[PDB]
Coordinates of C-alpha atoms and ligand atoms in Angstrom, one line a residue:
Chain A
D1 CA -41.6 -22.0 41.2
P2 CA -41.4 -18.8 38.8
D3 CA -40.1 -16.7 41.8
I4 CA -37.8 -19.4 41.9
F5 CA -33.9 -18.0 42.0
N6 CA -31.2 -20.7 41.1
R7 CA -28.5 -19.4 43.2
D8 CA -27.2 -21.7 45.7
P9 CA -28.4 -20.3 49.6
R10 CA -25.3 -21.4 51.3
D11 CA -24.2 -18.4 49.5
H12 CA -26.3 -16.0 52.2
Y13 CA -26.7 -18.3 54.4
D14 CA -25.0 -20.4 57.5
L15 CA -26.9 -23.3 57.8
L16 CA -26.7 -24.9 61.1
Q17 CA -28.8 -27.4 62.9
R18 CA -30.5 -30.4 61.3
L19 CA -33.7 -30.9 62.8
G20 CA -36.0 -32.3 59.9
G21 CA -37.2 -35.8 59.7
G22 CA -38.0 -33.5 54.4
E23 CA -35.3 -32.1 56.1
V24 CA -35.0 -28.7 57.7
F25 CA -32.1 -26.2 59.0
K26 CA -31.0 -23.6 60.5
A27 CA -29.8 -21.0 59.3
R28 CA -29.0 -17.6 58.9
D29 CA -28.2 -14.3 57.3
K30 CA -24.6 -14.1 56.7
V31 CA -25.4 -10.3 56.1
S32 CA -28.5 -9.8 58.3
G33 CA -27.4 -12.1 60.6
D34 CA -30.8 -12.6 61.0
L35 CA -31.8 -16.4 61.9
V36 CA -34.0 -18.5 58.8
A37 CA -35.6 -22.0 58.6
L38 CA -35.1 -24.1 55.6
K39 CA -36.9 -26.7 54.2
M40 CA -35.1 -28.5 51.7
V41 CA -36.1 -31.9 50.3
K42 CA -34.4 -33.8 47.0
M43 CA -35.5 -32.6 43.6
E44 CA -35.5 -35.1 41.0
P45 CA -36.1 -32.9 37.7
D46 CA -38.7 -35.6 36.2
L47 CA -46.8 -31.1 45.5
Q48 CA -44.6 -28.2 45.3
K49 CA -48.1 -26.2 45.8
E50 CA -46.4 -25.2 49.2
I51 CA -44.4 -22.8 47.9
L52 CA -47.7 -20.9 46.5
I53 CA -49.5 -20.6 49.1
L54 CA -46.8 -19.5 50.9
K55 CA -45.9 -16.3 49.1
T56 CA -49.4 -15.3 48.7
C57 CA -50.2 -15.6 53.1
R58 CA -49.6 -12.3 54.9
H59 CA -50.1 -13.3 58.9
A60 CA -49.2 -13.0 61.8
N61 CA -50.6 -16.2 62.5
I62 CA -48.9 -18.3 59.3
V63 CA -45.0 -19.5 59.3
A64 CA -43.2 -16.5 57.3
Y65 CA -42.0 -17.0 53.9
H66 CA -39.1 -15.7 51.8
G67 CA -38.7 -17.3 49.1
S68 CA -37.1 -21.0 47.7
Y69 CA -34.1 -21.7 45.7
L70 CA -33.2 -24.8 43.7
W71 CA -29.7 -25.9 43.8
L72 CA -27.8 -29.6 41.7
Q73 CA -31.4 -31.3 41.5
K74 CA -31.7 -29.6 45.3
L75 CA -34.5 -27.8 46.2
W76 CA -34.3 -25.1 49.3
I77 CA -37.7 -22.6 50.5
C78 CA -36.3 -19.9 53.0
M79 CA -39.0 -20.1 56.1
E80 CA -39.7 -17.6 60.0
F81 CA -37.5 -19.6 62.2
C82 CA -40.0 -19.8 65.6
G83 CA -37.0 -20.8 68.5
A84 CA -38.4 -23.5 70.2
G85 CA -40.4 -25.3 67.4
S86 CA -43.8 -26.8 67.2
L87 CA -45.9 -27.8 69.8
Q88 CA -45.3 -31.0 70.2
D89 CA -41.8 -30.6 70.8
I90 CA -41.8 -28.4 73.5
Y91 CA -44.9 -31.1 75.2
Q92 CA -42.6 -34.1 75.2
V93 CA -40.9 -32.5 77.2
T94 CA -43.7 -30.1 79.0
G95 CA -46.0 -33.0 79.2
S96 CA -49.9 -31.7 78.7
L97 CA -50.9 -27.7 79.0
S98 CA -52.7 -25.2 81.0
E99 CA -56.0 -24.8 79.7
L100 CA -55.4 -21.1 79.6
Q101 CA -52.3 -21.9 77.9
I102 CA -55.0 -24.4 75.4
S103 CA -57.2 -21.7 75.9
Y104 CA -54.6 -18.7 73.9
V105 CA -53.1 -21.2 71.0
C106 CA -56.5 -22.7 70.3
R107 CA -57.2 -18.2 69.8
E108 CA -54.1 -17.9 67.8
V109 CA -54.0 -21.3 65.4
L110 CA -58.6 -19.9 64.5
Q111 CA -56.7 -16.5 63.4
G112 CA -54.5 -17.9 61.3
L113 CA -57.2 -20.5 60.0
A114 CA -59.5 -17.6 60.1
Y115 CA -57.3 -15.4 57.3
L116 CA -56.1 -19.0 55.3
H117 CA -60.2 -19.5 54.9
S118 CA -61.3 -15.9 53.3
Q119 CA -57.7 -16.5 51.3
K120 CA -59.8 -19.2 49.8
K121 CA -56.9 -22.8 51.7
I122 CA -57.8 -24.8 53.2
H123 CA -53.7 -26.2 56.0
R124 CA -55.9 -29.4 56.5
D125 CA -53.5 -30.8 58.6
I126 CA -53.9 -28.6 61.9
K127 CA -52.3 -30.6 64.8
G128 CA -49.4 -30.0 67.2
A129 CA -46.8 -30.8 65.5
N130 CA -47.6 -28.1 62.9
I131 CA -47.8 -25.5 65.3
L132 CA -44.6 -23.7 66.1
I133 CA -43.6 -21.4 68.8
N134 CA -41.0 -18.8 68.5
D135 CA -38.5 -18.0 71.6
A136 CA -41.3 -15.3 72.5
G137 CA -43.7 -17.2 73.1
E138 CA -45.6 -16.7 69.7
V139 CA -47.8 -18.2 67.6
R140 CA -46.7 -19.4 63.4
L141 CA -48.8 -22.5 61.4
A142 CA -46.3 -24.8 58.9
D143 CA -46.7 -27.9 57.0
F144 CA -49.1 -26.4 53.8
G145 CA -47.7 -29.9 51.9
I146 CA -51.2 -31.6 52.0
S147 CA -53.2 -27.7 52.2
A148 CA -55.7 -27.3 49.9
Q149 CA -56.5 -24.0 47.1
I150 CA -60.3 -23.4 46.4
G151 CA -61.1 -21.3 43.3
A152 CA -65.9 -25.6 45.8
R153 CA -64.9 -28.5 47.2
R154 CA -62.4 -30.8 47.9
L155 CA -62.2 -34.3 46.9
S156 CA -59.0 -35.6 48.3
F157 CA -58.5 -38.1 50.4
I158 CA -55.6 -37.1 52.9
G159 CA -54.5 -35.8 56.3
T160 CA -53.8 -37.2 59.8
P161 CA -55.7 -39.4 60.0
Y162 CA -56.6 -38.9 64.3
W163 CA -56.6 -35.0 62.6
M164 CA -59.0 -35.6 60.2
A165 CA -62.3 -34.4 60.1
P166 CA -65.4 -37.2 59.1
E167 CA -66.0 -35.6 56.1
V168 CA -62.5 -36.1 54.9
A169 CA -62.1 -39.7 55.7
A170 CA -65.4 -40.9 54.5
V171 CA -64.7 -38.3 50.7
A172 CA -64.3 -40.9 48.4
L173 CA -68.6 -41.9 49.7
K174 CA -69.6 -39.2 51.1
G175 CA -68.9 -36.7 48.3
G176 CA -65.9 -32.9 48.9
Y177 CA -65.6 -31.5 52.4
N178 CA -64.7 -27.7 52.1
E179 CA -62.4 -25.7 55.0
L180 CA -64.2 -26.1 58.4
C181 CA -62.1 -29.4 58.6
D182 CA -59.2 -27.3 60.3
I183 CA -61.8 -26.6 63.1
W184 CA -62.5 -29.9 63.5
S185 CA -58.6 -31.0 63.3
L186 CA -57.9 -27.6 66.0
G187 CA -61.0 -30.0 68.3
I188 CA -57.8 -32.9 68.6
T189 CA -55.2 -30.9 69.2
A190 CA -56.9 -28.9 71.5
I191 CA -56.8 -32.7 73.6
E192 CA -53.8 -33.7 71.7
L193 CA -52.9 -30.4 74.1
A194 CA -55.2 -31.4 77.1
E195 CA -54.1 -35.3 77.3
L196 CA -50.5 -35.4 75.4
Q197 CA -52.2 -37.6 72.9
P198 CA -54.4 -37.3 70.0
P199 CA -58.7 -39.4 71.5
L200 CA -57.5 -43.6 69.8
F201 CA -53.7 -42.9 69.4
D202 CA -53.4 -45.8 70.4
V203 CA -55.6 -47.7 67.1
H204 CA -54.6 -48.3 64.0
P205 CA -55.3 -44.7 61.7
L206 CA -56.4 -46.1 58.6
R207 CA -59.3 -48.0 62.0
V208 CA -59.5 -44.7 63.4
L209 CA -61.5 -44.0 59.6
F210 CA -63.3 -46.9 59.8
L211 CA -64.6 -46.1 62.6
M212 CA -65.0 -42.2 62.2
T213 CA -67.2 -43.1 59.4
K214 CA -70.1 -45.7 60.9
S215 CA -73.4 -43.6 61.6
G216 CA -73.5 -43.6 65.5
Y217 CA -69.7 -42.4 65.7
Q218 CA -69.7 -40.8 69.1
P219 CA -67.4 -37.3 68.6
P220 CA -63.9 -37.2 71.4
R221 CA -64.6 -35.2 74.7
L222 CA -61.5 -34.5 77.2
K223 CA -61.3 -37.7 79.4
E224 CA -60.4 -35.7 83.3
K225 CA -64.4 -34.1 83.6
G226 CA -63.5 -31.6 86.4
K227 CA -60.0 -31.3 85.2
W228 CA -61.5 -28.6 82.9
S229 CA -63.4 -26.4 83.0
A230 CA -67.3 -25.7 80.9
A231 CA -65.7 -23.2 78.5
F232 CA -63.7 -25.7 77.3
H233 CA -66.2 -28.9 77.2
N234 CA -68.6 -26.8 74.7
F235 CA -65.5 -25.8 72.5
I236 CA -64.5 -29.1 72.5
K237 CA -68.5 -30.4 72.2
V238 CA -68.8 -27.5 69.2
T239 CA -65.6 -27.9 67.3
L240 CA -65.8 -31.0 66.9
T241 CA -69.4 -31.4 65.3
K242 CA -69.9 -34.7 63.1
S243 CA -72.0 -32.5 60.4
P244 CA -70.4 -29.9 58.7
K245 CA -73.0 -28.2 57.7
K246 CA -73.9 -28.0 61.9
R247 CA -69.6 -26.6 62.9
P248 CA -69.0 -23.5 63.3
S249 CA -66.8 -21.4 61.6
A250 CA -62.4 -19.9 62.5
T251 CA -64.0 -16.3 62.5
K252 CA -67.4 -17.6 64.5
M253 CA -65.6 -19.8 67.3
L254 CA -62.8 -16.8 67.9
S255 CA -65.2 -15.1 69.1
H256 CA -66.0 -18.3 71.8
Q257 CA -66.0 -18.1 75.3
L258 CA -62.9 -20.2 75.5
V259 CA -60.8 -17.6 73.4
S260 CA -62.3 -14.1 74.0
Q261 CA -62.1 -14.6 77.6
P262 CA -59.5 -12.3 79.0
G263 CA -55.9 -13.0 80.7
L264 CA -54.8 -14.6 76.5
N265 CA -51.3 -14.0 75.1
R266 CA -47.8 -14.8 73.9
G267 CA -47.0 -14.8 78.2
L268 CA -48.9 -18.0 78.7
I269 CA -46.4 -19.2 76.7
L270 CA -43.0 -18.8 78.6
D271 CA -44.8 -19.5 81.1
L272 CA -44.8 -23.0 79.5
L273 CA -41.4 -22.3 77.8
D274 CA -39.6 -22.2 81.8
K275 CA -40.7 -25.5 82.2
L276 CA -38.3 -26.3 79.9
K277 CA -36.2 -25.8 82.7
Chain B
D1 CA -54.6 -68.8 79.6
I2 CA -53.5 -65.6 80.1
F3 CA -51.8 -65.0 83.1
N4 CA -52.2 -61.6 86.2
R5 CA -48.7 -62.4 88.0
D6 CA -46.1 -60.6 86.5
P7 CA -43.9 -60.7 83.1
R8 CA -40.9 -59.9 84.7
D9 CA -41.3 -62.9 87.8
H10 CA -40.0 -65.1 84.7
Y11 CA -37.4 -63.3 82.4
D12 CA -35.2 -59.9 82.3
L13 CA -35.4 -56.3 80.8
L14 CA -31.8 -55.9 79.7
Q15 CA -32.0 -53.8 76.2
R16 CA -35.1 -51.7 74.8
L17 CA -35.9 -53.0 71.3
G18 CA -38.1 -51.2 68.0
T19 CA -44.6 -51.8 67.1
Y20 CA -48.0 -50.8 69.4
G21 CA -45.4 -51.9 72.6
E22 CA -41.7 -52.4 72.5
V23 CA -39.4 -54.4 72.4
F24 CA -36.8 -55.5 75.2
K25 CA -34.5 -58.3 75.7
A26 CA -34.6 -61.2 77.9
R27 CA -33.4 -64.1 79.6
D28 CA -35.6 -66.7 81.3
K29 CA -34.8 -67.4 85.1
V30 CA -34.7 -71.3 85.3
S31 CA -32.6 -71.9 82.1
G32 CA -31.1 -69.2 80.1
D33 CA -33.3 -68.5 77.8
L34 CA -33.8 -65.5 75.4
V35 CA -37.5 -63.8 74.8
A36 CA -38.6 -60.2 74.2
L37 CA -41.6 -59.7 75.1
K38 CA -44.0 -56.7 73.8
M39 CA -45.3 -54.1 76.5
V40 CA -48.5 -52.6 75.3
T41 CA -61.1 -58.0 70.6
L42 CA -58.7 -57.3 73.1
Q43 CA -57.1 -60.3 72.6
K44 CA -57.0 -60.9 69.2
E45 CA -53.7 -60.9 68.6
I46 CA -52.2 -63.9 71.3
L47 CA -54.9 -66.1 69.3
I48 CA -53.6 -66.2 66.1
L49 CA -50.2 -66.0 67.8
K50 CA -51.1 -69.0 69.4
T51 CA -52.8 -71.9 67.3
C52 CA -48.6 -71.4 65.6
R53 CA -46.1 -73.5 65.3
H54 CA -44.1 -73.5 62.8
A55 CA -40.9 -72.5 61.6
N56 CA -41.3 -68.7 60.0
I57 CA -43.4 -67.7 62.6
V58 CA -42.1 -66.1 65.6
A59 CA -42.0 -68.7 68.9
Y60 CA -44.9 -67.3 71.6
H61 CA -44.6 -68.3 75.1
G62 CA -47.2 -66.5 77.0
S63 CA -48.8 -63.9 77.5
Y64 CA -50.1 -61.9 81.0
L65 CA -50.1 -57.3 79.4
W66 CA -46.5 -58.1 78.2
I67 CA -47.2 -60.1 74.6
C68 CA -43.8 -62.4 75.6
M69 CA -42.7 -63.9 72.1
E70 CA -39.0 -65.3 70.4
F71 CA -36.2 -63.5 70.4
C72 CA -35.0 -62.3 66.7
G73 CA -31.3 -60.8 67.4
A74 CA -30.5 -59.2 64.3
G75 CA -34.2 -57.4 64.0
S76 CA -35.9 -57.0 61.4
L77 CA -35.1 -56.9 57.6
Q78 CA -35.2 -53.4 58.1
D79 CA -32.7 -52.8 60.8
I80 CA -30.5 -54.4 58.8
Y81 CA -30.9 -53.4 55.3
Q82 CA -30.7 -49.6 57.1
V83 CA -26.9 -50.5 57.6
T84 CA -26.1 -53.3 55.0
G85 CA -28.4 -51.7 52.0
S86 CA -29.3 -53.6 48.8
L87 CA -29.9 -57.4 49.3
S88 CA -28.5 -59.5 46.8
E89 CA -31.0 -61.1 44.4
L90 CA -30.1 -63.9 46.3
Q91 CA -30.8 -63.2 49.8
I92 CA -33.8 -61.3 48.6
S93 CA -34.7 -65.0 46.9
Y94 CA -34.5 -66.7 50.1
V95 CA -35.9 -64.2 52.1
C96 CA -39.0 -64.8 49.8
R97 CA -38.9 -68.4 49.8
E98 CA -38.7 -68.0 53.2
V99 CA -41.3 -66.2 53.4
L100 CA -44.1 -67.6 51.2
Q101 CA -43.5 -70.6 53.4
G102 CA -45.2 -68.3 56.4
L103 CA -47.9 -66.9 54.4
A104 CA -49.3 -70.9 53.2
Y105 CA -48.9 -71.8 56.3
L106 CA -51.0 -69.1 57.6
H107 CA -53.1 -69.5 55.0
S108 CA -53.9 -73.0 55.3
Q109 CA -54.8 -71.7 58.9
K110 CA -56.9 -69.4 57.6
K111 CA -54.9 -66.8 58.9
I112 CA -53.9 -62.9 56.9
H113 CA -50.9 -61.6 58.0
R114 CA -52.2 -57.5 56.3
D115 CA -48.8 -55.8 57.4
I116 CA -46.0 -57.8 55.4
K117 CA -43.4 -55.0 55.4
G118 CA -40.0 -55.9 55.6
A119 CA -40.2 -54.4 59.3
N120 CA -42.4 -57.4 59.9
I121 CA -39.4 -60.1 59.2
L122 CA -37.3 -60.5 61.4
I123 CA -34.2 -62.2 61.9
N124 CA -32.6 -64.2 64.6
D125 CA -29.2 -65.1 65.7
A126 CA -29.4 -68.7 63.7
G127 CA -30.0 -66.4 59.9
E128 CA -33.5 -68.0 60.6
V129 CA -36.2 -66.0 59.0
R130 CA -39.5 -65.2 60.8
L131 CA -43.1 -63.7 60.5
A132 CA -43.9 -60.6 63.4
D133 CA -46.6 -58.3 64.3
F134 CA -50.1 -60.1 64.5
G135 CA -51.7 -57.4 64.8
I136 CA -53.5 -56.3 62.5
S137 CA -53.5 -59.9 61.8
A138 CA -57.9 -61.9 60.4
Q139 CA -58.9 -65.0 61.9
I140 CA -61.3 -66.1 59.4
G141 CA -63.6 -67.6 61.1
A142 CA -68.0 -69.2 61.3
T143 CA -68.7 -65.7 60.6
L144 CA -71.3 -65.6 57.3
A145 CA -71.1 -62.9 54.9
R146 CA -68.1 -61.2 56.3
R147 CA -66.1 -58.3 54.9
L148 CA -62.4 -58.6 55.3
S149 CA -60.9 -55.0 57.4
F150 CA -59.9 -51.7 56.2
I151 CA -56.7 -51.9 57.8
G152 CA -52.2 -52.7 56.5
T153 CA -49.8 -49.5 55.4
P154 CA -50.7 -48.3 52.2
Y155 CA -47.6 -48.1 50.9
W156 CA -48.2 -52.4 50.9
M157 CA -51.0 -52.6 50.1
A158 CA -53.0 -54.4 47.5
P159 CA -55.4 -52.0 45.3
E160 CA -58.9 -54.3 46.5
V161 CA -57.6 -53.6 49.9
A162 CA -57.5 -49.8 49.2
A163 CA -61.7 -49.7 48.5
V164 CA -63.9 -48.1 50.6
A165 CA -66.6 -49.4 48.3
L166 CA -69.8 -50.8 49.0
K167 CA -68.9 -53.5 45.2
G168 CA -65.3 -54.8 46.4
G169 CA -63.2 -57.0 49.7
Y170 CA -60.2 -58.9 49.9
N171 CA -58.8 -62.4 50.5
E172 CA -55.6 -64.0 51.6
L173 CA -54.6 -63.2 48.9
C174 CA -53.2 -59.3 49.1
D175 CA -50.5 -61.1 51.3
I176 CA -49.0 -61.8 48.4
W177 CA -48.8 -58.6 47.2
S178 CA -46.5 -57.1 50.3
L179 CA -44.6 -59.5 49.4
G180 CA -43.9 -58.4 46.1
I181 CA -43.5 -55.0 47.7
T182 CA -41.6 -56.4 50.5
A183 CA -39.0 -57.9 48.1
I184 CA -38.6 -54.4 46.0
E185 CA -38.1 -52.2 49.3
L186 CA -35.7 -55.1 50.1
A187 CA -34.3 -54.2 47.5
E188 CA -34.3 -50.6 46.5
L189 CA -34.7 -49.8 50.0
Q190 CA -38.0 -47.5 49.3
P191 CA -40.9 -49.8 48.8
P192 CA -42.4 -47.9 45.8
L193 CA -44.1 -44.6 46.0
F194 CA -42.7 -44.2 49.4
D195 CA -42.3 -40.8 48.7
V196 CA -46.2 -39.8 48.1
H197 CA -48.3 -39.3 50.7
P198 CA -49.6 -42.3 52.7
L199 CA -53.4 -42.3 52.4
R200 CA -53.2 -39.8 48.2
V201 CA -51.4 -43.7 47.1
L202 CA -54.5 -46.1 48.5
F203 CA -56.6 -43.6 46.6
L204 CA -54.1 -43.8 43.6
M205 CA -54.2 -48.0 44.1
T206 CA -58.5 -47.6 43.2
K207 CA -58.4 -45.5 40.4
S208 CA -59.2 -46.6 37.1
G209 CA -56.0 -47.5 35.0
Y210 CA -53.6 -47.7 38.3
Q211 CA -51.1 -49.8 37.0
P212 CA -48.6 -52.0 39.7
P213 CA -45.3 -50.8 39.5
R214 CA -41.8 -52.9 39.6
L215 CA -38.4 -52.6 39.3
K216 CA -36.8 -49.4 38.9
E217 CA -33.6 -50.8 37.6
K218 CA -34.2 -53.3 34.9
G219 CA -30.8 -54.5 34.2
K220 CA -29.6 -55.5 38.2
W221 CA -32.2 -57.9 37.9
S222 CA -32.5 -61.0 36.6
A223 CA -35.7 -61.7 34.3
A224 CA -37.0 -63.9 36.7
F225 CA -37.0 -61.7 39.8
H226 CA -38.5 -58.7 36.8
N227 CA -41.0 -61.7 36.9
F228 CA -41.1 -62.7 40.4
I229 CA -42.5 -59.4 41.0
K230 CA -44.3 -59.5 37.8
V231 CA -47.2 -61.8 38.8
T232 CA -47.1 -61.2 43.0
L233 CA -48.3 -56.9 42.1
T234 CA -51.0 -58.9 39.7
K235 CA -54.1 -56.0 39.8
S236 CA -56.2 -58.5 40.0
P237 CA -57.2 -60.7 43.0
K238 CA -58.7 -63.4 40.7
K239 CA -55.5 -63.7 38.3
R240 CA -53.4 -63.5 41.6
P241 CA -51.4 -67.1 42.1
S242 CA -51.5 -68.4 45.9
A243 CA -48.7 -68.9 48.7
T244 CA -48.3 -72.8 47.5
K245 CA -48.0 -71.5 44.1
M246 CA -45.3 -69.2 44.5
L247 CA -43.2 -71.3 46.1
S248 CA -43.1 -73.7 43.5
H249 CA -41.2 -70.3 40.7
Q250 CA -38.7 -69.9 40.1
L251 CA -36.9 -67.7 42.2
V252 CA -37.5 -69.6 45.2
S253 CA -37.0 -72.5 44.3
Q254 CA -34.1 -72.3 42.1
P255 CA -30.7 -73.9 43.1
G256 CA -28.4 -71.3 46.1
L257 CA -30.9 -70.9 48.6
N258 CA -30.2 -72.4 52.0
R259 CA -29.4 -70.0 54.9
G260 CA -26.0 -69.4 54.8
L261 CA -27.1 -66.5 52.6
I262 CA -28.9 -64.3 55.9
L263 CA -25.3 -65.3 58.0
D264 CA -23.2 -63.0 55.0
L265 CA -25.8 -60.4 55.0
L266 CA -25.3 -61.1 58.7
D267 CA -21.6 -60.4 58.6
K268 CA -22.5 -56.7 56.8
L269 CA -23.7 -55.6 60.0
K270 CA -20.4 -56.9 62.2
Ligands
B49_1 C1 -37.5 -27.8 71.6 C2 -36.8 -30.1 71.4 N1 -35.8 -29.8 70.2 C3 -34.3 -29.1 71.6 C4 -33.6 -29.0 71.2 C5 -35.6 -29.3 69.4 C6 -36.8 -29.7 68.3 N2 -37.3 -29.1 67.4 C7 -36.7 -27.1 66.4 O1 -35.5 -27.5 67.2 C8 -37.4 -27.0 65.3 C9 -36.9 -25.8 65.7 C10 -35.8 -24.8 66.5 N3 -37.6 -25.4 64.6 C11 -38.0 -26.2 64.0 C12 -38.8 -26.0 62.7 C13 -39.4 -25.0 62.0 C14 -39.1 -24.0 62.6 O2 -38.5 -23.5 63.0 N4 -39.7 -22.7 61.2 C15 -40.1 -23.5 60.1 C16 -41.1 -23.7 58.9 C17 -41.1 -24.5 58.2 C18 -41.6 -25.4 58.6 F1 -41.7 -26.0 58.1 C19 -40.7 -26.5 60.4 C20 -40.5 -24.9 60.9 C21 -38.0 -27.7 64.7 C22 -38.8 -28.7 64.6
B49_2 C1 -31.2 -50.6 63.7 C2 -30.8 -52.0 63.3 N1 -30.2 -52.9 64.5 C3 -30.0 -54.2 63.9 C4 -28.4 -54.0 63.8 C5 -31.5 -52.2 65.7 C6 -31.2 -53.6 66.6 N2 -31.7 -54.6 66.9 C7 -33.1 -54.9 67.2 O1 -33.8 -53.3 67.1 C8 -34.5 -55.6 67.5 C9 -34.0 -56.6 68.3 C10 -32.7 -57.0 68.4 N3 -35.0 -57.5 68.3 C11 -36.3 -56.4 68.1 C12 -37.2 -56.8 67.6 C13 -38.0 -58.1 68.2 C14 -37.6 -59.3 68.3 O2 -36.4 -59.5 68.5 N4 -38.4 -60.4 68.6 C15 -39.9 -59.9 67.9 C16 -41.9 -60.6 68.0 C17 -42.0 -59.5 68.3 C18 -42.1 -58.0 68.0 F1 -43.0 -57.4 67.5 C19 -41.6 -57.7 67.3 C20 -39.9 -58.7 68.1 C21 -35.4 -55.2 67.6 C22 -37.1 -53.7 67.3

C-alpha cells in the first residue's frame, strides 16, 4: 500500500493472456524478457493485506512478489509466473497423482508452511488450486487473500469449507484458533490429489462445516485402502487430527516418513507434466 | 416410487445445460415432449418436488438416479441477465409477483426453498416463471422441537439463518429475505456484498448493528420498489411479512404485469 508504484504496469509489461476468474494475466517484462503474473482487481477508492504478507515473504515455496501497481482505479499485483498453473489445473487433465508425486508436493508445501508459521502467518486456504507448479516441476504457494498475520489466535470464519479445519468451522462457538489449521487443509489436499476431489465434495459446503463440528465426527480417510502405503494412511491419520492441541506442526511433519523418504524431487512433477501429453 | 430402469428408455439427451447433477435437453419417445433431467435422507428433493402441483414450481415427471423435470428453454434468470443486463423495474416486479405465488403455495404446503436466487428461477420458452433446485429445501413435518439446518447460499441468506449460536433458528420467512436479495440481484446483476468472502458475509450478518442492504442507486428505482426492498429485507423475522402478505404490496399488485414483459426480455436474447 505504501510501496505501491503509481504507474501503468503495461509500460514495462506486455500482457499476454487471461488466466483468472479477480483476474490474472500472463505478462513479460519488456526489457528483461522475464515472464510474470499480474493479478488485477478493480478498485473503487471508497482485504489488500495479501500484499503485506507477500512483500514480507522470502521463500522458494512461496510465490515471489515483485511490486504492486495502481492505475485508473485498477490495482495490479506482480508475482512469480508458474508455467503449469495450479495442481488443480493439472490433475483435472492428468488424473490422480502417484503417491510419490503427492509425497513430494506435501514436503514442499510443509516447507512453505513451516517458514510461513515461523513468520507468525497462516495461509488458511491450502488447496490444490492454490498450489502452483512451474515448468521446472517446482512448487509454490499462492492466494494469500484470506491468509492471516498474527501479532495470538484468529477469530475469523473463513476458508474453503471442504479444506477447513474443524476448529475453524466451529470458531463462532469454540473461540479462536491458530496456525495448525493449515496442517488439516494439507491433509485434505493430499486426498484431493489422491482422489481428484476432497472428501464430502458433493455435500453442501455449509453442511460439511456443520457435520465437522459434530461430536463424534470422523476425520476423512483415503478410500482405496490397499492402493496406498502404510506411510500415506498414517500421514492422513495424523494430519487430519481433530483436536488442534494434538495435531502436529509443519516442522514435526517434515520429519514424517512419507515426506522424509528418499527419491522425492522436482523430477516426479516433471514426470507428471509429461502426462499432459 | 422410484424406477429401476434407464432414463434413456423414455427420453433423449440432445444438448447439455448448467446445480449438482447436470441438466440435459431431452425428448419423450412417445409424444414429443421436452424435458430436462438432473444427474446425480437421499430421497429428499424428489419427495418435495413430488406433492407439488403449482404453475410457478417446475413440473416433476419421474425419477430413477435422474430426477426428471420440466424443461425451461431460456435457462435461469441468471443466464438471461448475463446477456440482457439490468432487468427493468417492471420485469423484476413481475418475476417477484410470480415467485411469491410460488413461495406462498410452498409455505402453505409446509415447504421452504432455502436457495432462492436468480440462478434458481427458470424461465421456459412460454415466458412462464418457475422455481427449481429444491436440493436443500425443507419439509416441516411432525418432528418435535426441530431447528432448521445451517444451509443456503450466504449472499442470499437471512441473518437469522447465518446464526449458529444456541439461541436462534428460522422459519419460512427466510425465503422472503432471499427474494429481496434476488430482486437487487436482478437489478444490479450482483447480490449485495458479492465481492466479500461468502463465509465473512455470514459472520457480518450476525454481528451487532447489522444493516439490511438497499438498492445502490436511488433515482433509477421507484419508491414502491425501494420500499419493497426495505420490507422483504427486514432484519427481524417477526416483523418480516409473509408470502401471502407480500402478494398485495404496491409493486407486485400494480397494473402492467403480464408474461408479455418476460417475452420482451426473451428478445433481448434473440
Ligand atoms: C494447465 C491447464 N491450462 C492449460 C492452458 C492452464 C490453466 N492454468 C494457467 O494457465 C495458469 C498459469 C500458466 N499461471 C496461473 C496462475 C498463477 C501463476 O502462474 N503465478 C501466480 C501467482 C499468484 C496467483 F494468485 C496466481 C498465479 C494459472 C492459473
Ligand atoms: C448462458 C445463458 N444461456 C441462456 C441464454 C444458457 C442456455 N440455457 C441453459 O443454460 C439452461 C436451460 C435451457 N435449461 C437449464 C436448466 C434447467 C431447465 O431447463 N429445467 C430445470 C429443472 C431443474 C433444474 F435444477 C435445472 C433446470 C439451463 C441451465
